Structures are given as C-alpha cells and as structure tokens.
Ligand binder design. Structure first.
Ligand SMILES: *[C@@H]1O[C@H](CO)[C@@H](O[C@@H]2O[C@H](CO)[C@@H](O[C@H]3O[C@H](CO)[C@@H](O)[C@H](O)[C@@H]3O)[C@H](O)[C@H]2NC(C)=O)[C@H](O)[C@H]1NC(C)=O
Ligand SMILES: *[C@@H]1O[C@H](CO)[C@@H](O[C@@H]2O[C@H](CO)[C@@H](O[C@H]3O[C@H](CO)[C@@H](O)[C@H](O)[C@@H]3O)[C@H](O)[C@H]2NC(C)=O)[C@H](O)[C@H]1NC(C)=O
Ligand SMILES: *[C@@H]1O[C@H](CO)[C@@H](O[C@@H]2O[C@H](CO)[C@@H](O[C@H]3O[C@H](CO)[C@@H](O)[C@H](O)[C@@H]3O)[C@H](O)[C@H]2NC(C)=O)[C@H](O)[C@H]1NC(C)=O
Ligand SMILES: *[C@@H]1O[C@H](CO)[C@@H](O[C@@H]2O[C@H](CO)[C@@H](O)[C@H](O)[C@H]2NC(C)=O)[C@H](O)[C@H]1NC(C)=O
Ligand SMILES: *[C@@H]1O[C@H](CO)[C@@H](O[C@@H]2O[C@H](CO)[C@@H](O)[C@H](O)[C@H]2NC(C)=O)[C@H](O)[C@H]1NC(C)=O
Ligand SMILES: *[C@@H]1O[C@H](CO)[C@@H](O[C@@H]2O[C@H](CO)[C@@H](O)[C@H](O)[C@H]2NC(C)=O)[C@H](O)[C@H]1NC(C)=O
Ligand SMILES: *[C@@H]1O[C@H](CO)[C@@H](O[C@@H]2O[C@H](CO)[C@@H](O)[C@H](O)[C@H]2NC(C)=O)[C@H](O)[C@H]1NC(C)=O
Ligand SMILES: *[C@@H]1O[C@H](CO)[C@@H](O)[C@H](O)[C@H]1NC(C)=O
Ligand SMILES: *[C@@H]1O[C@H](CO)[C@@H](O)[C@H](O)[C@H]1NC(C)=O
Ligand SMILES: *[C@@H]1O[C@H](CO)[C@@H](O)[C@H](O)[C@H]1NC(C)=O
Ligand SMILES: *[C@@H]1O[C@H](CO)[C@@H](O)[C@H](O)[C@H]1NC(C)=O
Ligand SMILES: *[C@@H]1O[C@H](CO)[C@@H](O)[C@H](O)[C@H]1NC(C)=O
Ligand SMILES: *[C@@H]1O[C@H](CO)[C@@H](O)[C@H](O)[C@H]1NC(C)=O
Ligand SMILES: *[C@@H]1O[C@H](CO)[C@@H](O)[C@H](O)[C@H]1NC(C)=O
Lengths: 1026, 49
C-alpha cells in the first residue's frame, strides 16, 4: 500500500528558541506530498538511507521496538531500542537474529533511560537521523480523531537523545511483541528523508506553526525566495536552470613513443652481481598491466607504491637495475636488511622510492654442470654506499694477517660463482630481479603513459577534454579553417570556441549547454495558487527532453516567444491591457476564457482610433470636467547615522584600536552620511519652507461654493493636519528597529516635525486660496477665490465669463473630485506606491546591512567575542582585520547605494520644489507638468517623507464637428480671427474660442484684415458687421 | 627564431622566395612554430658553424 504525506516529517532543526520570525533551513526533511508507505503487520498461525520518518497510530502500544544496522546478523554491530511498561532500553552490540536475539557477543555499549512512549487514535511520530556517526532521535505524541489516515495538521518533533554510533548503517526494521499466537493485524507509516530547504514560521510561543517546501513547486520556490507566506501578483526571478551534461569524453592523440622495456626483460644475460650495470630510460610510454601480462611473474613485492599507481605516475630519471641472484638473495636487497651481499656487493638506500620484479631464470641461465660466470664479492672494507660498483681487483685481507700478492689463507678479492643448477638448487636456482626506483625530484616529466582516450560524441552536452583543455557543452561541425600548428581556437572574450580532435584532424565548434532565466508568474497568493513558469531565451523544444521539479516540463501548455517560452498559461488571440509584463510584448493575466486560469497574450497599446481629419473639419468641445488628480513625489528619506566603532566592532577595545588605522575611511563614511542627512533637511526646507510668513485661513470659509474642508486643517485633531493628510499618514506604514539601534545604525529625526510640515502646507494652502500667485512673488495680496479662478481660466485661453456663468457647476465638480480622491485613498492601498517603496528600499538596505553581520567574510566565525575568547592576540587580530575589511566594504557599499538613492531623492525633491513654485505658487503653461489637461492650480499635502499635489486641471469634453475656414474674404481682403477660430454650423459662420464652443457674430472687433483673398489657400465668402 | 624559456628551447621558422633586390626587403610574414625541446640547461652564448 502507498499514500501521500501531506504536512508530516517536520522537526525543530536545533535547540534554539525564536519568535515571530520566518527562518530558512537546509537539512534532512520528509518532502511535502511524498510517497509514504502504509505498512500492515499481519501474522499467519526496510532500507535506512538518509534517515527514516516513522508514524504509528495503533492502540494498546502494540508497536514497540526498532533495529538499525548494515547486516543485523551479529557479524556487525547493531542498534536496538525496546520498550515495556516501566522504561525503555537501548543497546549497540552484535546480536544474533529473548525471542528478538539469540546471543550477545562483542557488546561494548548499552543505555538505560526514561520511557519515551507513554477509539480516538494517537500519532507517535519518530524521526531517526545519522550524520557523522551521530544518531539523533526526535518524537511527538498527538491524539487525533479515529482513522483519518495521516490527516491535515502540522506539528514539529522535539529532540530526545543523540547517540555516538560508530558503524555503517544501511537498513532498519520494526519489531513488536504480541501475547498459541493470537491472530491480529496492525498498521504504521514509513517515509524517507531527503536534503531539502524548508521555510519555518515561528509563533509568539516559538513553536514551528507552518512550513513551506521551497524545492516542491514554483509557488513555494517564490515563497522561499521572498521569505514570505504571501506572494503579491507579478513575476519573480527564481533560481537559474542549467541542463546538466550527459557523460565525460576525453580526446588524446594515437599511441606513439613506446618504452622498449620488454627487451631488458628478454635480455639473454643480465648484469653481474658485484659489477651490476645501471640504466636510465626516458621520453616514452610504460604500462604495468602488460608488464605482468606478456612476462608473467609470481615473486614480487613493492615498497611505498601501489601496483596500479605506477601507470599514472610520470618519470624523468628512473633508475633500473637488472641482475641474476639466488632465490634466497632475492628478498635480501631490501633497505636496512643485513647480509654479506647487501653489505659488500649491492644494497638500496633507506629512502628507496621503488619496487622489485623477480622471475625464474634457471631454465635460461643454468647449465647441467653449473653456470660458473655469475661471480660476486662477499668482502669489502665496510658497508658499501647505495648504488656503488667496484671492479678494482685489489687483494682483500679477510684473515688476521695482511693477505697480499696473488692470494692468501682464506683471502681473495673475487669469489667463485654459485653452483647454479636447475633441479639441485631448491631456492638456490638463479632468478632475474629488476629494481625500478623513481626518486625523481626534478622539473621535467618524460614517462607517464599512453594517456588513454574515449569514444567521440557530438550534438550533446559532455565534459569534453582535449590534451588538458577541459570544458562542458555540445560539439557541432566546424566552418573554421585552422592551420597545421593551430590546435584549438579562441574568440574575442578569450574563451575556447572551436577545438580539433587530436586523434583524427577534424575540428568541431563548442557551445556549452543551453540555459536562461527561470521566472515564476503568479496572481495574488490569496486569489489563486496555480502559477506559470517562463524559461528566458531557451527554445522549449529542449526543456521537455530535459525532464529539481520537472512536472511542468511536459505540460500541455507551451507557448514560444522572443523573451523565451512560457509553460502553464494558454496563449489567446484577443488583446487586453498589460497586467504582468513577460517581455517582448507578451503579458500574462489570470481570468476565465467558467473556470479561471493564467493566460498569456500580445499586449494592446490602447483602443484603435481614426481621427476624422479633413480639409475643413474641426472638433470643438462644448463642456468641461474639473479633474483633480493626485501626484505623489518623494521629498526626503530617513536620515541615517552610522558609527564605525559600534557596527564594525562589538564594543571591543582590540577591534577599536585595529579600526583606528582605517580612521580616514570612517571619517569619509561619516562625512558622506552627514552630507546626506543635511541634504534631506535642505530638501524638506527647499520643498516646503518657500514662504517667509505663516498665513492663517479666515474663520469664515466662504470661497464661492468651493469646499476646502478636506484639505484645510481641523483644530479637533491634536496634530493640526487635514482629513486627506490624516488618510495619507495612515496609508503609509513607517522588533527590528531595536536590533538596528543596538547594532549602531540610528535614525536621526527630521529637523521639521510633521506638525510644522503640516503648518507650512497649511500656510501655503491659505496663501493659495486667499492671495493666489501674489504671495509667491512679494507681499501676499488678498483676492476672492472666484476671481482667482477667473484668472486661472484666463491663463489656459478660456474667457473668464465661462467660470462665472458656470460657478456652481465648477464648484460641484471640484467637490465631487475631492470626494472621489477621499474614496480612492480610503479604499485601495496602492495609491501611495512611491513613498511606501522608498520607505521599503531604506528598510531593506538597513535590514541587508544588519544581516551582513552574520557573514564570516572568510573568518572562523561572524562574532568577535568568541574570536577573542578562543584565540591568542596574533591569530585573533589576523582574523579580526579580515572581518573589519569585510564589514567596512559592506558599510562602503551601503553608503554608495545611499549616495545614489539620495541623488535620485534630490532629483525628486528639486522636481517637487519646481512643482510647488510653478503649480502651487503660480499657474504653469508647461503641458502635462502640473497634471493631465490645462492646469488651473495645485494644493500641497504633507505625506510621510514626501508631498502630494492635488493638480486641478480643465479637461474639455462633449466635442462636436464643425466646418472651418482659415480666413474670411468680405470686400476682397482676407479677415483673420483676433483670438479664436472660424466655424460654421452649416448656414452661418462664427468666431469662437479654441477650448470651449461659444459662437459669436463675426464683426470688425474680433477679426483683423491682412492683404487680399487671392493668396490664402482655403479662404471662404461671408459678411462682417460694422 | 631561437628561444629558451623555463628550460624549453623553441624554434620558429618561415620560408619565403625573393627576387634578391637587396637584404631584408619590405614585407610582412610570421614564423610558424616547428619544434620545442625540454632541454633544461643554461644558455648564454651561441655560435654559427
Ligand atoms: C456639462 O456637463 C455637466 C456634467 O458634467 C452637466 O451637468 C449635468 O446636468 C444634468 C441636467 O442639467 C444633470 O442631470 C440630472 O439633473 C438632476 C440633478 O441635478 C436630476 O434630478 C436629473 O434626473 C438628472 O439626472 C446632471 O446631474 C449634471 N451633472 C453634474 C455633475 O452636475 C451640464 O448640464 C453640461 N452643460 C452643458 C451646457 O451641456
Ligand atoms: C464640505 O464637505 C464636508 C464633507 O463632505 C461637509 O461635512 C459633512 O457635513 C455633513 C452634513 O453637513 C455631515 O453629514 C452627517 O451629519 C451628521 C453628523 O452628526 C449626521 O447625523 C448625518 O447623518 C450625516 O451623516 C458629514 O459628516 C460631514 N463630513 C465631514 C467629513 O465632516 C461640509 O459640510 C462641507 N462644507 C459645507 C460648507 O457644507
Ligand atoms: C445655425 O445658426 C444660425 C444662426 O444663428 C441659426 O439661425 C437662427 O435660428 C434661430 C431659431 O433657431 C433664429 O431665431 C429667431 O427665430 C425667429 C425668426 O423670425 C424669431 O421670431 C425668434 O424670436 C428668434 O429670434 C435666428 O434668427 C436665426 N439666425 C438668423 C441670423 O436668422 C440656425 O438655426 C442654425 N442652424 C443649425 C442647423 O444649427
Ligand atoms: C502561547 O502560549 C500561551 C500560554 O503560555 C497561550 O495562552 C493561553 O492559551 C490557552 C490555549 O490557547 C488559552 O485557553 C488561554 O486563555 C491563554 N492565556 C492567556 C492569558 O491568553 C497562547 O494562546 C499561546 N499563543 C498562541 C499564538 O498559540
Ligand atoms: C530552437 O532555437 C531557436 C529559438 O526558437 C530556433 O530558431 C528559430 O527557428 C524557427 C524555425 O526554424 C524560426 O522561424 C525562427 O525565426 C528562429 N528564431 C531565431 C531567433 O533563431 C531554432 O530553430 C531551434 N533549434 C535550435 C537547434 O536552435
Ligand atoms: C465627425 O464626422 C465624422 C464623419 O462624418 C465622424 O466619424 C464617424 O464616426 C462613426 C461612429 O463614431 C463611424 O462609424 C464612421 O466611420 C466615422 N467616419 C469617419 C469618416 O471617420 C465623427 O464621429 C464626427 N465627430 C464626432 C465628434 O462625433
Ligand atoms: C466670393 O465672391 C466673389 C464675388 O463677390 C467671387 O469672385 C468671382 O469669382 C468668379 C468665379 O471665379 C469670377 O468669374 C468673378 O470674376 C469673380 N468676381 C469678382 C468681383 O472678383 C469669388 O469667387 C467668391 N469666392 C469663392 C471662393 O468662390
Ligand atoms: C509509490 O511507489 C510505488 C512503487 O515504488 C508505486 O507503485 C506507487 O504508485 C507510488 N505511489 C505514489 C502515490 O506515488
Ligand atoms: C523492561 O525491560 C528491561 C530490560 O529490557 C528490564 O530491566 C525491566 O525489568 C523490564 N520491565 C518490565 C516492567 O517489564
Ligand atoms: C569479539 O568476540 C570474539 C569471541 O568470539 C573475540 O575472538 C574477538 O576478539 C572479539 N573482538 C572484539 C573487537 O572485541
Ligand atoms: C589514429 O589511428 C586511427 C586508427 O586507424 C587512424 O584512423 C587515425 O588516422 C590515426 N591518427 C593519427 C594521427 O595517426
Ligand atoms: C487577499 O484576499 C483576502 C480575501 O480573500 C483579503 O482578506 C486580503 O486582504 C487579500 N490580501 C491582501 C494582501 O490584500
Ligand atoms: C488565432 O487565430 C489563428 C487564425 O487566425 C488560429 O490558427 C489560432 O488557432 C488562433 N489562436 C488560438 C489560441 O486559438
Ligand atoms: C481639399 O482642397 C483641395 C484644394 O484644391 C482639393 O484638391 C481637395 O479635393 C480637397 N479635399 C477633398 C477631400 O475634397
């Protein structure tokens, strides 16, 4: 039987308390939704690889006992756990498989301890792990409902005990004791752990409440990468994919330059004993396999080198000595061994980096009468130096008297050769011995081996090697024309691009295994859980054959695009607004095409339109909308202060004295940050403090129907802000601050408090609504808001009569616009994106800075205190200086990023100051500067580290067609409109303003004369009143 | 071209026909490598036979 493990196989990774923190771990866990074996134990009257997760839900404690080992037959040590009524007993010994075991031999360690395990069934979760000879056991007891077959539910297993088990473990078994055998059946669950990366969520109590398997599905991969349980709708770049190579191929030239070492093995007569000949070969190829294949031998023992080792080791100055010796003298030449021949004929150095090969030579050297030609000398002045030969025939005085002349009593220089006979000498028969030594100690290398190659593969990623040039990828037919001296080809980027086969002189291109970006496209995690996967710049004929999660690699949804391919969304022919941009004009959405799914499509650039252009057709608007639009501008950012001493050094005197050497760097960093903070204050002053005096709105708020109650301050609230200002303040969200403060990263408060910023804004509002643009230039001059509105209308080329004749309508439009602003700000949280993401950037920068303190930067650890405690000053300081360099580099990176961010914030603040000067303090003519349409006025509103402009704009609407002429000819002379345009309703002609349909009688006042009507193209005929 | 670097003695050569207007005419050509020998001896002075 089998089933799926939903949320089981989770434990506390280490004995450490945490709280309200999402922690990422890499350890042995049971993967989520895994193939868990449902065992049933029934009587008729398992491999332990990378830990085991064991679950039991049976009653009456029926399942009692565990076995772990490699053989479990008392040949090798075994681990056994057994439980009964009162306690639990553990052994690690060789038990012969008390019905459990027969005999106890070689027993070394046993453990006796507290009990572990004490119709609603209960789960008894156990986890067994074995790492570097340490066996950790984890457990948990959880009563549940009846049956439920591994229900939905999460809980982690606390550790109980760890065992120092020093034996290889391969298989584990369960045992149980039963009460004539009673018939019975039971059930348990077995799961296998893998090296996985998990994300654990800790509650306020520090209990692991929930987990995410990062390496299960793309959605959980995005969850683990963002370190959050909720993922906002969009596209997120996850870990990069690379198709792995298939095999390894090695290419070398054909076999050349052979060592003729067979001939010296096949020599008719070998070198003498006392007069051994020394020989050296180099610059060829030798093998040991063929050496004992062609020339078989049985008497050989080698010192310091493995028989297989000689084949791959590359010689320059190898010493070879071959001679015929007696079988009993074959083993006597070993260094430090005493003997007549060793001390007076030939011996090897103590540091003999070599080995001996011996074989029989009786049948090739011995005669019937004996070979009396292998003469030697078992007499010398002393123990001769290693690798020395002597042929000087000086008489040796062996006896007590100076034996001189031809001979003496038992005195002679040479000795008669051994009676070398085939059968008579049992171990005295001659043997040929060759001693090969390789005490090289030299730069050149000559004699290594044929350096064997393998078969050639093509059109497939491989680990290719060409005469030491190593790489990975596919090979293809080469169009390059090499030259005989050229071997491989490089490109502009100094990388290998084409290589020639050293065996046969054919050349192939090199292209490493195709790869690209992996992106996950998701809607809101709350909205849905199905995701799409984008493979960037990879042809998706390759990923399906590349089928760690590869479930989606052979999905029925594949769409190919310029950006790459998309899997998990269906391409559709119709075009919508872009929601999630994919790239190269492809956008993804989540909709029902009634079941909802992810789709991909070509983005629409807006509704198709054809402007009704003609010779003489104009469209004139007859109505307008007073559109009030919010423009959010960041003005300042959180003024940050950092002290080197607190951050870089954990209040250590030694670290402080080592850091004082970098005083220049620290003063530069402090100067840069102080400059940034003073610049933030200057930004706020330049944007807001543009008024010499603080103006006050009158108690009578009568502005000809315009209602400024939502933007003017309300005395009720303690901080005298407005309704809209309060909404903006609530929308932006401004512990980790305590940790930042404790690590020496402080936030200096702005010079201007939110109260005085609101007071500056209120002064600007009062000046704007009571004086208009005049308070910007010089002394504030009072003017009714109606006539200021008439002036703003006159500014955009609309005659002031329009506003006075529609005063109530414009006032109602403005009020409804403010109402819509209030509703939009109250409803959605996406309004103040810019200020919120600025705050998020600053918070992320500070969090990254605090997190880099965990990096060791190649030191022993990331904490100075343990370094000081565990190290004597010199090694302590040689670690601490590296740590200081790392942390100073992190601080420099932070300060540089802050300088660039402060430059962009200063650009935004200069733009905000320009907008306050040109939109608030006056009416701007710059198109689309102070909002979309014809700008009328603006209202500043303070917001957390920024400003909001309520750009009031005139937008024409309800346009209609008219017939138009460039000029009028009345009395043979052309007439032109003073300021407006000629239009005809079909019968009569009229002069009108260009932004509001208002026809007027064509008279001498609104028109001026110029030349005659035979030059202007498109002039028409009409009459002009005096 | 005769070189010796890290005990490795390298020979480069090239063969060109000329009308023998005069010694070392105007022209461009490179010397393709022929043989490198791992000699590893001291070279300071050289002579032509
Ligand atoms: C220019 O556009 C104005 C709207 O942008 C438009 O105002 C609209 O006028 C109509 C009729 O005068 C109103 O319609 C409603 O009138 C009353 C409420 O006052 C209702 O009882 C009726 O049933 C009807 O629904 C609109 O309410 C009003 N819109 C606004 C925002 O006030 C002007 O009339 C237009 N001017 C010209 C010259 O076309
Ligand atoms: C300017 O606009 C203001 C908001 O649109 C408006 O204030 C609003 O006034 C109305 C009635 O005058 C209030 O409506 C509520 O009045 C009482 C309050 O106890 C309730 O019992 C009623 O049921 C009703 O809900 C709004 O509460 C009030 N809104 C705010 C935000 O204060 C001003 O009156 C407008 N200015 C002028 C001159 O009229
Ligand atoms: C195009 O514009 C024409 C010029 O304004 C317009 O003609 C005008 O039409 C109105 C009635 O629709 C006339 O108004 C007078 O009508 C009678 C005439 O006897 C009087 O008794 C009334 O009291 C009223 O004053 C205008 O007299 C007339 N303009 C002229 C100069 O005669 C056309 O109707 C417009 N046509 C279209 C299709 O838009
Ligand atoms: C964290 O543990 C505390 C106990 O130390 C929990 O507080 C009690 O929880 C029980 C069961 O949930 C309630 O019956 C009590 O009313 C709680 N006591 C108090 C004073 O609130 C607390 O609920 C746990 N928190 C979480 C998130 O599980
Ligand atoms: C897969 O890789 C590229 C990328 O799609 C393929 O190149 C396209 O091939 C199709 C059909 O032959 C053409 O219509 C496109 O114009 C090609 N585009 C580009 C950018 O090259 C290529 O044919 C496929 N196979 C291989 C081996 O690359
Ligand atoms: C001005 O007149 C033109 C043409 O007389 C109008 O354009 C037509 O609009 C209708 C529906 O909007 C289409 O079915 C026609 O194909 C259009 N014709 C042309 C030639 O473009 C235009 O709508 C009129 N202007 C306004 C503001 O309505
Ligand atoms: C505007 O009216 C004038 C006359 O009042 C037109 O001028 C005449 O045009 C015709 C045809 O080209 C000529 O035969 C006459 O000789 C012109 N008379 C004069 C006095 O110039 C003129 O054509 C009209 N405008 C247009 C655009 O037709
Ligand atoms: C579990 O594995 C067995 C054999 O290894 C297989 O027969 C069975 O279908 C698998 N079950 C699941 C749910 O994958
Ligand atoms: C449990 O078993 C141990 C030995 O394995 C023994 O010492 C102990 O007496 C047993 N207790 C009971 C209650 O069976
Ligand atoms: C294991 O026990 C056997 C007795 O059968 C003994 O010969 C051997 O020396 C023991 N080995 C160890 C390592 O204790
Ligand atoms: C290597 O030997 C093979 C086997 O016949 C031959 O085809 C190939 O041409 C040889 N290459 C060289 C460089 O000798
Ligand atoms: C996700 O949707 C739920 C309702 O289904 C809503 O309560 C929640 O606010 C949404 N998430 C976010 C981040 O707004
Ligand atoms: C888009 O239209 C073409 C023909 O115009 C058709 O072949 C194709 O199947 C359509 N796309 C989809 C996703 O059905
Ligand atoms: C626009 O005026 C020119 C001037 O001669 C004329 O040729 C053209 O036909 C006119 N356009 C149309 C659409 O009639």
């Amino acid at each position: 039987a089998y089933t799926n493990s939903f949320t089981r196989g989770v434990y506390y990774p280490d004995k450490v308390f945490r709280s309200s923190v999402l922690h990422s771990t890499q350890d042995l866990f049971l993967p989520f939704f895994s193939n868990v074996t449902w065992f049933h134990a029934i009587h008729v009257s398992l491999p332990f690889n990378d830990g085991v997760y064991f679950a039991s839900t049976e009653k009456s404690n029926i399942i009692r006992g565990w076995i772990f080992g490699t053989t479990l037959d008392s040949k090798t040590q075994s681990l056994l756990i057994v439980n009964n009524a009162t306690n639990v007993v553990i052994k690690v010994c060789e038990f012969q498989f008390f019905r459990v075991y027969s005999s106890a031999n070689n027993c070394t360690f046993e453990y006796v301890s507290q009990p572990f395990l004490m119709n609603f069934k209960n789960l008894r979760e156990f986890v067994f792990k074995n790492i570097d000879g340490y066996f950790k056991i984890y457990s948990k007891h959880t009563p549940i409902n009846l049956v439920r077959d591994l229900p939905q539910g999460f809980s982690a297993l606390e550790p109980l005990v760890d065992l120092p088990i020093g034996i290889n473990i391969t298989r584990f078994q369960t045992l149980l004791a039963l009460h004539g055998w009673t018939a019975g059946a039971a059930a348990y669950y077995v799961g296998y752990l893998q090296p996985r990366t998990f994300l654990l969520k800790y509650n306020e109590n520090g209990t692991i409440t929930d987990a995410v398997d990062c390496a299960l599905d793309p959605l959980s991969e995005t969850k683990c990468t963002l370190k959050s349980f909720t993922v906002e709708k969009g596209i997120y770049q996850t870990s990069n994919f690379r198709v792995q190579p298939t095999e390894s191929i090695v290419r070398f030239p054909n076999i050349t330059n052979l060592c003729p070492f067979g001939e010296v093995f096949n020599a008719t007569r070998f070198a003498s004993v006392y007069a051994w000949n020394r020989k050296r070969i180099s610059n060829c190829v030798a093998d040991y396999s063929v050496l004992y294949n062609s020339a078989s031998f049985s008497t050989f023992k080698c010192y310091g080198v493995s028989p297989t080792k000689l084949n791959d080791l590359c010689f320059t100055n190898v010493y070879a000595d071959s001679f015929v010796i007696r079988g009993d003298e074959v083993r006597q030449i070993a260094p430090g061994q005493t003997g007549k021949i060793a001390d007076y004929n030939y011996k090897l150095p103590d540091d003999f980096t070599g080995c001996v090969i011996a074989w029989n030579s009786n049948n090739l050297d011995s005669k019937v009468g004996g070979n009396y030609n292998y003469l030697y000398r078992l007499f010398r002045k002393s123990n001769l130096k290693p690798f020395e030969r002597d042929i000087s025939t000086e008489i040796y005085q062996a006896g007590s008297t100076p034996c001189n002349g031809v001979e003496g009593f038992n005195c002679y220089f040479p000795l008669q050769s051994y009676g070398f006979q085939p059968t008579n000498g049992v171990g005295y028969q001659p043997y040929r011995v060759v001693v090969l030594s390789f005490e090289l100690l030299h730069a050149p290398a000559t004699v290594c081996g044929p350096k064997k190659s393998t078969n050639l593969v093509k059109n497939k990623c491989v680990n290719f090697n060409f005469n030491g040039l190593t790489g990975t990828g596919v090979l293809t037919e080469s169009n390059k024309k090499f030259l005989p001296f050229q071997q491989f080809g490089r490109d502009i980027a100094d990388t290998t691009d084409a290589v020639r086969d050293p065996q046969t002189l054919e050349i192939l291109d090199i292209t490493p295994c195709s790869f690209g970006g992996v992106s996950v496209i998701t809607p809101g995690t709350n909205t849905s859980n199905q995701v799409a996967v984008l493979y960037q710049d990879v042809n998706c004929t390759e990923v399906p054959v590349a089928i760690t999660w590869r479930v989606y690699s052979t999905g029925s949804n594949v769409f190919q695009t310029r950006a790459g391919c998309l899997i998990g969304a269906e391409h559709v022919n119709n075009s919508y607004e872009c929601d999630i941009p994919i790239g190269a004009g492809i956008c993804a959405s989540y909709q029902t095409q009634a079941s909802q799914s992810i789709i991909a499509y070509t983005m629409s650039l807006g509704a198709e339109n054809s402007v009704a252009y003609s010779n003489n057709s104009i469209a004139i608007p007859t109505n307008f909308t007073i559109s009030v639009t919010t423009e959010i501008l960041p003005v300042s950012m959180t003024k940050t202060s950092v002290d080197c001493t607190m951050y870089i050094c954990g209040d250590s005197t030694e670290c402080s004295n080592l850091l004082l050497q970098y005083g220049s760097f620290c003063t530069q960093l402090n100067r840069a940050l102080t400059g940034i903070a003073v610049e933030q204050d200057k930004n706020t002053q330049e944007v807001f403090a543009q008024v010499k005096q603080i103006y006050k709105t009158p108690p009578i708020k009568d502005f000809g129907g315009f209602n400024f109650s939502q933007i003017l301050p309300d005395p009720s609230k303690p901080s005298k802000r407005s309704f809209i200002e309060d909404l903006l303040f609530n929308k932006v969200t401004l512990d980790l601050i305590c940790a930042q403060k404790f690590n020496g990263l402080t936030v200096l408060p702005p010079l201007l408090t939110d109260e005085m910023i609101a007071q500056y804004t209120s002064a600007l509002l009062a000046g704007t609504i009571t004086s208009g643009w005049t308070f910007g230039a010089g002394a504030a001059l009072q003017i009714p808001f109606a006539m200021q509105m008439a002036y703003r209308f006159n500014g955009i080329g609309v005659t002031q009569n329009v506003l006075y004749e529609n005063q109530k309508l414009i006032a109602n439009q403005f009020n409804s616009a403010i109402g819509k602003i209030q509703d939009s700000l109250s409803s959605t949280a996406s309004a103040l994106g810019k200020l919120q993401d600025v705050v998020n950037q600053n918070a992320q920068a500070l969090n990254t800075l605090v997190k880099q303190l965990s990096s060791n930067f190649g030191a022993i650890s990331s904490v100075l205190n343990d370094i000081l405690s565990r190290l004597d000053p010199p090694e302590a300081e040689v670690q601490i200086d590296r740590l200081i360099t790392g942390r100073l580099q992190s601080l420099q990176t932070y300060v540089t990023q802050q300088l660039i961010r402060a430059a962009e914030i200063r650009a935004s603040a200069n733009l905000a100051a320009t907008k306050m000067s040109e939109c608030v303090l006056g009416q701007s003519k710059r198109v689309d500067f102070c909002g979309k349409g014809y700008h009328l006025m603006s209202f500043p509103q303070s917001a957390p580290h920024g400003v909001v402009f309520l750009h009031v704009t005139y937008v024409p609407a309800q346009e209609k067609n008219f017939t138009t002429a460039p000029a009028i000819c009345h009395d043979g002379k052309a007439h032109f409109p003073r300021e407006g345009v000629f239009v005809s309703n079909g019968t009569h002609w009229f002069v009108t303003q260009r932004n509001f349909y208002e026809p007027q009688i064509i008279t001498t006042d609104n028109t001026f004369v110029s030349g005659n009507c035979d030059v202007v193209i498109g002039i028409v005929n009409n009459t002009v009143y005096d």
